[PDB]
Design a protein around this ligand. Sequence first.
Ligand SMILES: [Cl-]
Ligand SMILES: [Cl-]
Ligand SMILES: [Cl-]
Ligand code: NA
Length: 412
Amino acid sequence: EIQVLKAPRAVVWKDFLGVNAQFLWFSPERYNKQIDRLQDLGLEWVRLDLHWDRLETAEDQYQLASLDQLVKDLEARQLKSVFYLVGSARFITTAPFYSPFQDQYPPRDPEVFARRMAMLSQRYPSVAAWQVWNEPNLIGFWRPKADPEGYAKLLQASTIALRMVDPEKPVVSAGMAFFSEMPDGRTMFDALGHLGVESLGTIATYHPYTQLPEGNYPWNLDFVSHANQINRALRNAGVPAIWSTEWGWSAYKGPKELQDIIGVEGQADYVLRRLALMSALDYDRIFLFTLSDLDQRASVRDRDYGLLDLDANPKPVYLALQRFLKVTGPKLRPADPPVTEDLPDGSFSIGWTREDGRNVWLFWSARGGNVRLPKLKEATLHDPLSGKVTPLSGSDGLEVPVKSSLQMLVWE
Ligand SMILES: [Cl-]
Ligand SMILES: [Cl-]
Ligand SMILES: [Cl-]
Ligand code: NA
């Protein structure tokens, strides 16, 4: 089946597309270079992970110097930042004494956590938004079992405390892993909705990782229909906004751990296809995982999600995204695809207009092939993975080659 998408509203990349960042893993010199590369894309939103057991190493004993300096740097570079705090400090963890995962258990008292998020927000008034925990539907962030009621109480205490510091500042709920599914078969969004958590007015967000850009398996590319369903449900619950705070693929060589091996070229291809989908769905903002490759402190797979390598230099995905954003320009308005004949089965098709008024068609199909555009005499085809630019012309319609990877047709 062909999947045509039309976005609900205009997209301004600087407002819409941010990146995750692990700036505290790096020297200031190195993270400022990563920031140079982010600004060269015309982007400014970053999402930073903070781990409570690294910030408060004993009760009321903190390690804030490097975060203090980072916040000043982010403000000086004019980035907009969302910070999330996750994990329990050792003095407050519900972990049993013998657990090797002390910070992966929730706090014994949600108010203690809430006070720390208020202290951070007070200390760092430049931060644009504050996010409460991460992926509480996943065992690795909330042991020993997912607990909707416990997360709801943590989110409520945190939302109250953050709003006391700054009643106007957004409060972002935890990014839910996947589409919020839990091991017990419920979904965290459904369970929190039954608890009335929409009454807190926090931003909703999830991390819809799928093996391929458009779904998990070639015979079931249901990303778009699944995202549409979740997003309509969140809208229907009255959420203020929907973000996706984490999505992406690793270029790692293996061994395979959950994600199939796709390499640097697969990373570039997949990120561009997924971006083309998510920017045409009902998200207010999304954050690619992640700005930089990571060293051996990260898992083998987690080392290679970067736009940038360890030296803060572009990987193929960065160069491809850069070519894509140069073709689109800074702002796209929803539009319709050109009229086609014989578009291949399984194609994806998305139309936009750029700031110069020209049309951009984003399209691909697993089966490749060709498509006829009967009503055009001129258009330019751009392959963002290779940099190839092809002027196409015909007296009676164009023929356009279709690839498994994204291409961009620009036409009047
Ligand atoms: Cl941290
Ligand atoms: Cl896990
Ligand atoms: Cl047309
Ligand atoms: Na297909």
